[PDB]
């Protein structure tokens, strides 16, 4: 479970990236990041 924590600490796809262009692909990526976030233990 530590590998996911390291990957998050390195490249957490936080919803703060919404400051860029509102591209639907980036929105789906943020949604996937938010759905993967509960895996953090």
């Amino acid at each position: 479970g530590t590998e996911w924590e390291k990957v998050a600490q390195l490249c957490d796809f936080n919803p703060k990236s919404s400051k860029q262009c509102k591209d639907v692909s980036r929105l789906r990526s943020v949604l996937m990041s938010l759905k993967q976030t509960p895996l953090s233990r």
Partner: protein, 38 residues
Amino acid sequence: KEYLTKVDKLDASESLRKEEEQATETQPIVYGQPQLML
């Protein structure tokens, strides 16, 4: 997930196709021009 969004866009395109079918069904109203009786 992006492909499911594309499938939703395909459903919107099917709704637009239904709108085109409604337009085709209404076309007989425009086809009935009274100037064609001359």
